[PDB]
Coordinates of C-alpha atoms and ligand atoms in Angstrom, one line a residue:
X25 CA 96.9 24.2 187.5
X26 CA 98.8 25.0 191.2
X27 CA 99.8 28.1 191.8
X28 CA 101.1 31.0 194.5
X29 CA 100.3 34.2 194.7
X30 CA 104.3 35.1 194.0
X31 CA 103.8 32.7 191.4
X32 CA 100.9 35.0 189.6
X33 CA 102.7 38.0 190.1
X34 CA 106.5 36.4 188.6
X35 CA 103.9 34.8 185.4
X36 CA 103.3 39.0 184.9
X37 CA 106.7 40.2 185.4
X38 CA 107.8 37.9 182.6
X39 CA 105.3 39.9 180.1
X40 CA 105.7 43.1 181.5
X41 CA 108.8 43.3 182.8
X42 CA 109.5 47.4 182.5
X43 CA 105.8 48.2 183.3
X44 CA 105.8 50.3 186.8
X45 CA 104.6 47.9 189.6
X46 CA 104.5 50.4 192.3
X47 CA 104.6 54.5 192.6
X48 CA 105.0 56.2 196.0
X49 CA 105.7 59.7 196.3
X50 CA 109.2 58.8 197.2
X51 CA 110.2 57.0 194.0
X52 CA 108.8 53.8 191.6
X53 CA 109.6 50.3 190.6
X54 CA 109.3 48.8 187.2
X55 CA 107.9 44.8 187.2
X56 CA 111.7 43.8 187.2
X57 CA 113.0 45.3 189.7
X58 CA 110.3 45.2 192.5
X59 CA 110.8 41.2 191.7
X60 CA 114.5 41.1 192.0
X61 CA 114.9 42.9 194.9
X62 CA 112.0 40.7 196.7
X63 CA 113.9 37.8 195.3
X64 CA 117.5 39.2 197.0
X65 CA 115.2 39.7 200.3
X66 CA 113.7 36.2 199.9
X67 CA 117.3 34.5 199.4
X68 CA 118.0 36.3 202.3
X69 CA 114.5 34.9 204.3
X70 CA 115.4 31.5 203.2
X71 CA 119.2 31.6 204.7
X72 CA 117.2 32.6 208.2
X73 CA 115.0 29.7 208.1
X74 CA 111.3 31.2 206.5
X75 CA 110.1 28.4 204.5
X76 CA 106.7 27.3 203.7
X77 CA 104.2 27.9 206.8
X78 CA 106.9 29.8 208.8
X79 CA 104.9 32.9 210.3
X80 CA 107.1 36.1 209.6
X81 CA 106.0 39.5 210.9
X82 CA 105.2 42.3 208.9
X83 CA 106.5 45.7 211.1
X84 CA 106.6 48.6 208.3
X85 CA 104.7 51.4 206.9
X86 CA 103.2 51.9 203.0
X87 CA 106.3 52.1 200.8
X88 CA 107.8 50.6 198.2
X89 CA 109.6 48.3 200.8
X90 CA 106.7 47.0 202.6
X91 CA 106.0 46.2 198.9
X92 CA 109.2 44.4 198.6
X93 CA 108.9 42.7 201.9
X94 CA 105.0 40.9 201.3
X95 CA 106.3 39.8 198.4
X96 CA 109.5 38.1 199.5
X97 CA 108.2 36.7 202.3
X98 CA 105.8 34.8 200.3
X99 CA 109.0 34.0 197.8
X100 CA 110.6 32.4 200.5
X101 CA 107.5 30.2 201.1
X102 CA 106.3 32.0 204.1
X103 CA 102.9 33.8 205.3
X104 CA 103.3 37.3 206.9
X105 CA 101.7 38.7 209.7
X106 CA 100.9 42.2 209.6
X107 CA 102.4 44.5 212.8
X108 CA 100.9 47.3 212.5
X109 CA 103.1 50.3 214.1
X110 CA 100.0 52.7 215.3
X111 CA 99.3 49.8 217.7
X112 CA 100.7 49.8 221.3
X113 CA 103.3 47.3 222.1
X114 CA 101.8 45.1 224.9
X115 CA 99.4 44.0 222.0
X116 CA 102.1 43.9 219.0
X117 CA 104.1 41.5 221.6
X118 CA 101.2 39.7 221.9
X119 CA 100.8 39.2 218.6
X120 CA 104.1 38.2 218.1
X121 CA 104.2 35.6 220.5
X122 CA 100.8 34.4 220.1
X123 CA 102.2 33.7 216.4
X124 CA 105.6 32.5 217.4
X125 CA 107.1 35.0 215.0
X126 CA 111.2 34.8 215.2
X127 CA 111.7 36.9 212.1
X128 CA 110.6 40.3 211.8
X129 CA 110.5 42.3 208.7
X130 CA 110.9 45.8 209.3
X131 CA 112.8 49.3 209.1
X132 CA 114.9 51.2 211.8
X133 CA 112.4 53.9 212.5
X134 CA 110.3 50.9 214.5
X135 CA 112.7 49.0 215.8
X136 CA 112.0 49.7 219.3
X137 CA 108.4 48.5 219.0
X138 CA 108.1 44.8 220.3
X139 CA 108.5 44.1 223.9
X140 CA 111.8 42.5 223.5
X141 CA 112.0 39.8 221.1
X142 CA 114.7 37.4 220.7
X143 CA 113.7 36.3 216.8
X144 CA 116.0 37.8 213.7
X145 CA 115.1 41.5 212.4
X146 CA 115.9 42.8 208.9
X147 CA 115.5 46.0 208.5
X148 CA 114.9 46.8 205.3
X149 CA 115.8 50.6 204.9
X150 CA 119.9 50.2 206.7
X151 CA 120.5 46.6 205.7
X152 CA 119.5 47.1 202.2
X153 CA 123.7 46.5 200.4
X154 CA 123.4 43.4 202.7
X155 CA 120.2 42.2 201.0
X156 CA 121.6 43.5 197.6
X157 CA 124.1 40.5 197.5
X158 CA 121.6 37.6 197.4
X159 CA 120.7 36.0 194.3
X160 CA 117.9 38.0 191.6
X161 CA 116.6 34.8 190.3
X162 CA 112.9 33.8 191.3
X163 CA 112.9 30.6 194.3
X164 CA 111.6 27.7 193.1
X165 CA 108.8 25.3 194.7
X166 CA 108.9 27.1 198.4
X167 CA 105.0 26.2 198.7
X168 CA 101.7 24.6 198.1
X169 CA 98.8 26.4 197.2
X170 CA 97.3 24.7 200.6
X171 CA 100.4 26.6 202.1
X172 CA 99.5 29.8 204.2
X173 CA 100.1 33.5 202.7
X174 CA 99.0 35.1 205.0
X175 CA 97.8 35.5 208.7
X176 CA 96.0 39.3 209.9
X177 CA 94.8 39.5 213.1
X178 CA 91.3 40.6 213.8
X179 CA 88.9 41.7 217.1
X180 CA 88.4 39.4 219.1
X181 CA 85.7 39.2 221.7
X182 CA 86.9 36.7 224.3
X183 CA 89.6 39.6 225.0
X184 CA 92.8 39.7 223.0
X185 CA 92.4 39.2 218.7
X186 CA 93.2 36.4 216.7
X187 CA 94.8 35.6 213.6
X188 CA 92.8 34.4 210.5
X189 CA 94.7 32.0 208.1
X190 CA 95.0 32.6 204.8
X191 CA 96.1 29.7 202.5
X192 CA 97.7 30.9 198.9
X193 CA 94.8 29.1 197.2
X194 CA 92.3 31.0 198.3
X195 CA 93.8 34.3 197.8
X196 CA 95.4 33.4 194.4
X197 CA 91.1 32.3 193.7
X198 CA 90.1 35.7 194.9
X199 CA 92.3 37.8 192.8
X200 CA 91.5 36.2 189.9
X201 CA 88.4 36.7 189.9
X202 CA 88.8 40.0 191.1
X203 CA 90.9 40.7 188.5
X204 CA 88.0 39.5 186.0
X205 CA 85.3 41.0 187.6
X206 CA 87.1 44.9 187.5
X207 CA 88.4 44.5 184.4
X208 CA 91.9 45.3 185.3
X209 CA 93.9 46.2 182.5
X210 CA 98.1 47.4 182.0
X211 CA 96.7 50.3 181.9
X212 CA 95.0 50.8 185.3
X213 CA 96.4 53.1 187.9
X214 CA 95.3 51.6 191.4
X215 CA 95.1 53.3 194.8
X216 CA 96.8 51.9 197.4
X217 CA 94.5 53.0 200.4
X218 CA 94.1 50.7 203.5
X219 CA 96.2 49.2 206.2
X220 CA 97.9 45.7 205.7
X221 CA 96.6 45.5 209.1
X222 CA 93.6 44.9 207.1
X223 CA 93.0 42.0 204.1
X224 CA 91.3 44.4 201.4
X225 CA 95.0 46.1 201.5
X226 CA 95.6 42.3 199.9
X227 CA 92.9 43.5 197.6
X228 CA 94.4 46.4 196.6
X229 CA 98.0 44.8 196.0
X230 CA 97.7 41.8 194.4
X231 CA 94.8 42.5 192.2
X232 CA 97.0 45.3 190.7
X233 CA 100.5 43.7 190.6
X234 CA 99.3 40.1 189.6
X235 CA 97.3 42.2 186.3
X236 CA 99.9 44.6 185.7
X237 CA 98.8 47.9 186.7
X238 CA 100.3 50.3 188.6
X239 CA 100.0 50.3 192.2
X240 CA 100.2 54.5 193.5
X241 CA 101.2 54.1 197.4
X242 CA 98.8 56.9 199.2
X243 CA 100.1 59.2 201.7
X244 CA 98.5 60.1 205.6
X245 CA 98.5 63.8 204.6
X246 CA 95.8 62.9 201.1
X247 CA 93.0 61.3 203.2
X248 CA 92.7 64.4 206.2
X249 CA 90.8 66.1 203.6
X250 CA 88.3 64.8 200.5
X251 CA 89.6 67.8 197.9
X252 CA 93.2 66.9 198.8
X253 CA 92.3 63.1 198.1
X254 CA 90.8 64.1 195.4
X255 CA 93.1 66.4 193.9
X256 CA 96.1 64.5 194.4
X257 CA 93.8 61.1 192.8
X258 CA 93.6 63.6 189.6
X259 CA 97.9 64.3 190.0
X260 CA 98.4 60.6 190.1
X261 CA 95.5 60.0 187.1
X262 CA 94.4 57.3 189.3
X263 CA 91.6 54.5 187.5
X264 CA 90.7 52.4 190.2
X265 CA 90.0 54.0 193.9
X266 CA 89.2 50.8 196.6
X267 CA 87.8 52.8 199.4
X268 CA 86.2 51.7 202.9
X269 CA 82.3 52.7 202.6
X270 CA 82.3 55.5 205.8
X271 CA 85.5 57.1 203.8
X272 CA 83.0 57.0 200.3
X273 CA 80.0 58.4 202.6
X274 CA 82.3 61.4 203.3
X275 CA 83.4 61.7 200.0
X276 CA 79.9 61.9 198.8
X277 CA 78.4 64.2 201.2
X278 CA 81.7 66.6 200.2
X279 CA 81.2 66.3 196.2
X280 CA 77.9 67.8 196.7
X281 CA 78.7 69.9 199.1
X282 CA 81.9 71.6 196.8
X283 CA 82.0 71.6 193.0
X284 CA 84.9 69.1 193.3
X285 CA 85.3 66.9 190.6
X286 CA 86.0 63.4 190.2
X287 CA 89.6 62.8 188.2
X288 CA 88.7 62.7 184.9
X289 CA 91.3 59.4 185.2
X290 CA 88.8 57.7 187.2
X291 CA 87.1 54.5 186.2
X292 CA 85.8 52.6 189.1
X293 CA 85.6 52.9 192.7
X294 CA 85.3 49.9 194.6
X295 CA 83.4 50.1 198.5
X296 CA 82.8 47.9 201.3
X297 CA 83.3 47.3 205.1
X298 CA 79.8 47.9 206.0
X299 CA 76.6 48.7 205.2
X300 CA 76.3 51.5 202.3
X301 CA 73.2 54.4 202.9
X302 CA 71.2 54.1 200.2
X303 CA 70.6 58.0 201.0
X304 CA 74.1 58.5 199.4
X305 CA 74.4 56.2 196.6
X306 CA 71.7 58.2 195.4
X307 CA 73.1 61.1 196.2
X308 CA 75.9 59.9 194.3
X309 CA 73.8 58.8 190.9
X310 CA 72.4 62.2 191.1
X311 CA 75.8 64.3 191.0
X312 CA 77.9 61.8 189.8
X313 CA 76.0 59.4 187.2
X314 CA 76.9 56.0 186.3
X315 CA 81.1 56.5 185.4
X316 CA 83.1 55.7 187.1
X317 CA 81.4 53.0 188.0
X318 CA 80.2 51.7 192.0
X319 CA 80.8 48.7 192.9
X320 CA 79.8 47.2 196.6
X321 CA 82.0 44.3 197.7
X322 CA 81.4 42.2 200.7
X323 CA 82.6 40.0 202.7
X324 CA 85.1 38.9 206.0
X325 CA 88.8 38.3 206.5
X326 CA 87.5 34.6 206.9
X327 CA 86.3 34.5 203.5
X328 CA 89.4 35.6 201.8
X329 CA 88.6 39.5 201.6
X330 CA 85.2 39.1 199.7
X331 CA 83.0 37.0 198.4
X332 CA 79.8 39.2 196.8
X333 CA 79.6 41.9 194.7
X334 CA 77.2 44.0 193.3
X335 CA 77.2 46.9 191.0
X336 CA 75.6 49.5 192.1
X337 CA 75.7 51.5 188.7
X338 CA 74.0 49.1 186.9
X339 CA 71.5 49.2 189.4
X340 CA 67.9 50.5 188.0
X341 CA 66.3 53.2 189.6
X342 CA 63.6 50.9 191.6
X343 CA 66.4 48.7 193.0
X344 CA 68.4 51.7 194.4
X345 CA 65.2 53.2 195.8
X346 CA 64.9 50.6 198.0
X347 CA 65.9 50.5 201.5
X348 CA 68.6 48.7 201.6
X349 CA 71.5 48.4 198.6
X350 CA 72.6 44.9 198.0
X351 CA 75.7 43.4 198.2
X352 CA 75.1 41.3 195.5
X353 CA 76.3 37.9 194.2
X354 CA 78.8 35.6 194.7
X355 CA 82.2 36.7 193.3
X356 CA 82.3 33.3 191.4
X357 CA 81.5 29.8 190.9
X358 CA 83.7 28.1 193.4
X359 CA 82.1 30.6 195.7
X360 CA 79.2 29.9 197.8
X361 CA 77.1 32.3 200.0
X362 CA 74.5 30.8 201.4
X363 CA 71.6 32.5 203.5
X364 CA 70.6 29.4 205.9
X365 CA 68.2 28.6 208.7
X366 CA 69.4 27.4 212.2
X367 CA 69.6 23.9 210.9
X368 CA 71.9 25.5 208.4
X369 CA 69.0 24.8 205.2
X370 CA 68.5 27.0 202.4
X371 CA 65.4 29.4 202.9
X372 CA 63.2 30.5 200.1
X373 CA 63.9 33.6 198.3
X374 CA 62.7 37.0 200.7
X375 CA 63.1 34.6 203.6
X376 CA 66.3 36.3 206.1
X377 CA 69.1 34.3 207.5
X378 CA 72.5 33.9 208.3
X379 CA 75.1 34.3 205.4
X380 CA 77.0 31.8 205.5
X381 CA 80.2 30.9 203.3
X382 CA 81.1 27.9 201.4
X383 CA 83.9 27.0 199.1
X384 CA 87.3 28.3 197.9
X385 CA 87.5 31.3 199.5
X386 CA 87.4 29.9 203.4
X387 CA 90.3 30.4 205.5
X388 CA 92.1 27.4 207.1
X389 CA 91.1 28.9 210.5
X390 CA 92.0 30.6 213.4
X391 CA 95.5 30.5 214.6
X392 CA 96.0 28.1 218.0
X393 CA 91.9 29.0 218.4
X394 CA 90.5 25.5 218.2
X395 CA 87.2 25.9 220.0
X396 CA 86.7 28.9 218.2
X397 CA 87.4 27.7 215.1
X398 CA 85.4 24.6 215.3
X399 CA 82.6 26.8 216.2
X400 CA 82.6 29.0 213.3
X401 CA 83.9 26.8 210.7
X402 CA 81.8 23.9 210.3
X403 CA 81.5 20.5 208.5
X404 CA 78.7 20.8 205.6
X405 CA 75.6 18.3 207.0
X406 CA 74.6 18.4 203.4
X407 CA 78.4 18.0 201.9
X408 CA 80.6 16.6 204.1
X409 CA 83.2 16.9 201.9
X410 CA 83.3 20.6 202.6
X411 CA 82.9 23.3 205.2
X412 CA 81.1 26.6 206.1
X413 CA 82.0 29.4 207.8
X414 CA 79.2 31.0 209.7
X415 CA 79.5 35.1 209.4
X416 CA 77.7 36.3 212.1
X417 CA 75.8 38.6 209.5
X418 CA 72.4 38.4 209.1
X419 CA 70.9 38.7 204.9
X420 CA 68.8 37.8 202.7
X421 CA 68.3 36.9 199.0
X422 CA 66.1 38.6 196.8
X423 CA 63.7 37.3 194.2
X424 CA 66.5 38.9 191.7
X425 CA 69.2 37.1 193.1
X426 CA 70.6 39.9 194.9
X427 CA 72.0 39.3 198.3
X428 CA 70.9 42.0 200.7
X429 CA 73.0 42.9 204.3
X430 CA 70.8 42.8 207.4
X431 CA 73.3 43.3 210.5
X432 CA 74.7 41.1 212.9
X433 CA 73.5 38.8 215.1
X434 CA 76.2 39.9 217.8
X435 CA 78.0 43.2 219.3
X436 CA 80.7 43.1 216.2
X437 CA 80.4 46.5 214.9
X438 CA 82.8 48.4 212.4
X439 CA 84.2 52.0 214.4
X440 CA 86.3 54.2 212.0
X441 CA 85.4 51.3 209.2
X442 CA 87.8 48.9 211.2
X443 CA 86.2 45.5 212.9
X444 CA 85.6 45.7 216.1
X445 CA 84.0 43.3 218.7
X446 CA 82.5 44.8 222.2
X447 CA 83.7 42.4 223.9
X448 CA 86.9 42.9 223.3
X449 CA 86.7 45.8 224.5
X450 CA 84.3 44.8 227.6
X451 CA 86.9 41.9 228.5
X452 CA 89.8 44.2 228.7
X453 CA 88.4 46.7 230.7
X454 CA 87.1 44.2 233.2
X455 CA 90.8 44.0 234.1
X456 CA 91.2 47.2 235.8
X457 CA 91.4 47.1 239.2
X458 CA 88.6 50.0 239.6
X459 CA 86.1 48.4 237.4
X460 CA 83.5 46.7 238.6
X461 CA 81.1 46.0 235.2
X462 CA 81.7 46.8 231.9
X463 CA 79.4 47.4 228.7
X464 CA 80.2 49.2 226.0
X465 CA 77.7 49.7 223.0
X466 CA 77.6 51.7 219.6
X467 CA 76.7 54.6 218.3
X468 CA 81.1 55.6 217.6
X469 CA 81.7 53.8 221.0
X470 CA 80.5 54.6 224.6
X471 CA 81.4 52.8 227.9
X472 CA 78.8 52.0 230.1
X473 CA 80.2 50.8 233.4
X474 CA 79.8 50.8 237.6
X475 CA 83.2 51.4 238.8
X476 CA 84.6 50.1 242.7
X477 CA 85.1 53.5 243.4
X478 CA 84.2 56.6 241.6
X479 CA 87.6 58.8 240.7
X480 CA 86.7 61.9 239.1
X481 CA 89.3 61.7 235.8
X482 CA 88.3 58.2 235.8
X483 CA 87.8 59.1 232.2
X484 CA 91.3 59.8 230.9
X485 CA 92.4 57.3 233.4
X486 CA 90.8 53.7 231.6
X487 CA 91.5 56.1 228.5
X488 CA 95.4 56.1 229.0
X489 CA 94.9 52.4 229.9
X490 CA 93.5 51.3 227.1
X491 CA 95.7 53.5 224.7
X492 CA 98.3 51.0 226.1
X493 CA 96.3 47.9 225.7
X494 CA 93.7 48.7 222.2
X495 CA 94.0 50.3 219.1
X496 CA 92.9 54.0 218.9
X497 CA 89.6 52.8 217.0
X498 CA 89.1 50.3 220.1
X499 CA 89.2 53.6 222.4
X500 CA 85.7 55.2 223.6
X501 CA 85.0 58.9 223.4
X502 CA 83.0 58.7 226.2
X503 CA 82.5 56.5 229.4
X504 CA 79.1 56.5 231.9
X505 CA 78.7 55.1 234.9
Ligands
LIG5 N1 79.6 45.8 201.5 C1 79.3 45.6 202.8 N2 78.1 45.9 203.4 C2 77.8 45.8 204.7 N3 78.6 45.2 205.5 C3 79.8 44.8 205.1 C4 80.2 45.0 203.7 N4 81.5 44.5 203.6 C5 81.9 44.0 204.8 N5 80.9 44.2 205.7 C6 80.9 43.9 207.2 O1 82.3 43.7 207.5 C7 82.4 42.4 208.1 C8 83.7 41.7 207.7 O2 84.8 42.5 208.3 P1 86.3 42.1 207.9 O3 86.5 42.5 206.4 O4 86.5 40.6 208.3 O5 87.2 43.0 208.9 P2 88.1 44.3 208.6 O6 87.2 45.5 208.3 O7 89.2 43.8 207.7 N6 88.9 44.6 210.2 P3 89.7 43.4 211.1 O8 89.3 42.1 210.4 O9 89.3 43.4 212.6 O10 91.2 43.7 211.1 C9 81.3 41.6 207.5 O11 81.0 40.4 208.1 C10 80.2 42.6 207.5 O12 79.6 42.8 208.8
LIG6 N1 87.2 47.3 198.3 C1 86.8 46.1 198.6 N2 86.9 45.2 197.8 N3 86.3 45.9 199.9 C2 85.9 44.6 200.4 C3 84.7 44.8 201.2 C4 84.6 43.5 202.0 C5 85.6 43.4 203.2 N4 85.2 42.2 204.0 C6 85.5 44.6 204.1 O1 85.2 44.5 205.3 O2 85.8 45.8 203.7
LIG7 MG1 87.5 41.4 204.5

């Protein structure tokens, strides 16, 4: 039973053809015509040479065409990178070379955005009666489910971030048990809420398109404020939010705060990307109750977007007055999360560990990282047949089954819900010329360094330089010395 992702979603355009697949306040696309126009586009991507494992970059913003654009890429048998455009250039180029992109999917308004590039643009919003005259007809046999889909770039702590490899099996494995797991129906109305820049935006898309909901593109302006997010959730009768756990905290502490209700639409909200207070979910079963239904989700990029869930509404009331709320079980059968010893052995239950992951939803690797790769994705001693990857995150299983999160044994942190690793941040400002040593720690980030000399704006000085270098979220509030 091989299959693509593409594959999944054309299988649901053939039974719901004149469904809608996407909504953005700017317009809509039925199940047809979101496929036919990423079929014109991939016609086009094959007559510029993507086929399977060619790397194509990703360089739009949330619309129906960046829609379009994932879709055909994969049609035409290649994996996209994600580019995304609130980054600075020097580390989109780097990106971009580091991935050997030489075709870049994107639109007008950011054309001016990598650091020269020699490779073939589309863009998507002034080429569009170009793209129009390639064939409407789904591509046949571009790839192999062992073929990649995707490749999203994450922190990385020996100084610049690297690419995590996402093969079509994994991600086809994930979203249909997703799919299973939340019950998504025609009817469902999903919220398109995160960054492609990061894989639960994969989440978010395919677990919708490949079930045949509807897909509701968010704005900027609905997040700056929970009763505009709200409100406009209610306009769109949205069923399924997917929301990064500090964005959930906020909402909470704002629903009790107001008399805002939830959209009466609302069915189930989906969290994850770090550690949920219990403080708040029962906060939340006190003002809320148990619908919609809470659902935790964990896992990393290198696991295929997540591998455990757990359900915090079905909770009892003694398992959500503990101290820490679980994270749950394994997402399926083919997926294995382990909580092992240094000698990677299985503990007994209450005994802590690493988490480590086994199974279908591993990524291939890391892109042109090697050592690194070999490092965190090992050969099973007890199945050699099969690998782990080791998460860096520290858990343990309870006598209920229920995985519980412990931290990291590292300085990865989440800042503004995104990954981020210190020493990412450490390495790069160890390359200006007036710093000396560099720390920088959480809690939000602060710099701790000894400069060569002491400047006096020496704060918006390594500020402006890293704006250059790092994403915003990468960027400390404060420095010391
Ligand atoms: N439900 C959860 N509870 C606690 N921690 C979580 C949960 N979900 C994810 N995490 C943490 O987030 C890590 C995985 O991050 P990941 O999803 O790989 O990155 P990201 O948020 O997409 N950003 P990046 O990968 O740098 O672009 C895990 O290893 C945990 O530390
Ligand atoms: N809504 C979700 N399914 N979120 C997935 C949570 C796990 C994912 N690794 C993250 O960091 O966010
Ligand atoms: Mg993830």
């Amino acid at each position: 039973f091989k299959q693509s992702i593409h594959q999944l979603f054309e299988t649901q355009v053939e039974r719901t053809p004149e469904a809608v697949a996407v909504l953005s306040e700017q317009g809509q696309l039925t199940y047809e015509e979101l496929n036919t126009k990423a079929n014109q586009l991939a016609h086009y991507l094959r007559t510029l040479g993507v086929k399977s494992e060619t790397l194509v970059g990703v360089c739009v913003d949330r619309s129906l065409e960046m829609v379009i654009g994932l879709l055909a890429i994969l049609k035409a048998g290649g994996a996209y990178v994600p580019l995304d455009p609130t980054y600075p250039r020097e580390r989109l180029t780097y990106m971009v070379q580091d991935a050997q992109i030489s075709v870049l999917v994107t639109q007008t308004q950011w054309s001016n955005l990598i650091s020269d590039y020699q490779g073939q643009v589309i863009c998507l919003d002034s080429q569009w009666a170009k793209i129009a005259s390639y064939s409407q007809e789904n591509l046949v046999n571009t790839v192999n489910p062992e073929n990649l889909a995707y490749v999203i770039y994450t922190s990385g702590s020996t100084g610049k971030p690297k690419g995590v490899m996402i093969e079509h099996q994994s991600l086809v494995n994930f979203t249909k048990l997703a799919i299973a797991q939340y019950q998504i129906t025609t009817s469902d109305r999903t919220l398109q809420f995160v960054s492609i820049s990061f894989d639960v935006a994969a989440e978010e898309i395919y677990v919708t398109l490949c079930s045949g909901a509807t897909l509701i593109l968010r704005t900027e302006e609905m997040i700056s404020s929970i009763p505009s997010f709200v409100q406009k959730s209610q306009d769109w009768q949205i069923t399924v939010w997917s929301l990064p756990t500090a964005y959930w905290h906020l909402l909470v502490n704002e629903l009790v705060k107001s008399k805002i209700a939830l959209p009466d639409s609302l069915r189930l909200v989906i969290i994850g990307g770090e550690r949920v207070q219990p403080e708040l979910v029962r906060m939340w079963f006190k003002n809320v109750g148990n619908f919609p239904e809470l659902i935790n989700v964990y896992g990393p990029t290198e696991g295929t977007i997540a591998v455990s869930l757990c359900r915090l509404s079905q909770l009892t009331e003694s398992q959500r007055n503990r101290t820490e709320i679980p994270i749950g079980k394994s997402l399926g059968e083919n997926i294995s999360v382990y909580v092992l010893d240094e000698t990677l052995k299985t503990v007994p239950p209450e005994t802590p560990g690493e988490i480590y992951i086994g199974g279908t939803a591993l990524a291939r690797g890391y892109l042109n990282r090697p050592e690194l790769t070999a490092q965190k994705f090992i050969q099973d001693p007890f199945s050699p047949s099969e690998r782990l990857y080791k998460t860096g995150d520290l858990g343990r299983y309870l006598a209920d089954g229920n995985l519980e999160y412990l931290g990291r044994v590292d300085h990865q942190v989440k800042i503004n819900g995104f990954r981020v690793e210190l020493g990412e941040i450490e390495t790069v400002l160890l390359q200006h010329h007036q710093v000396a040593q560099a720390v920088v720690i959480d809690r939000r980030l602060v710099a701790y360094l000894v400069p060569h000399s002491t400047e006096e704006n020496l704060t918006v000085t390594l500020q402006q330089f890293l704006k250059n270098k790092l994403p915003s979220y990468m960027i400390p509030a404060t420095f010391v010395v």
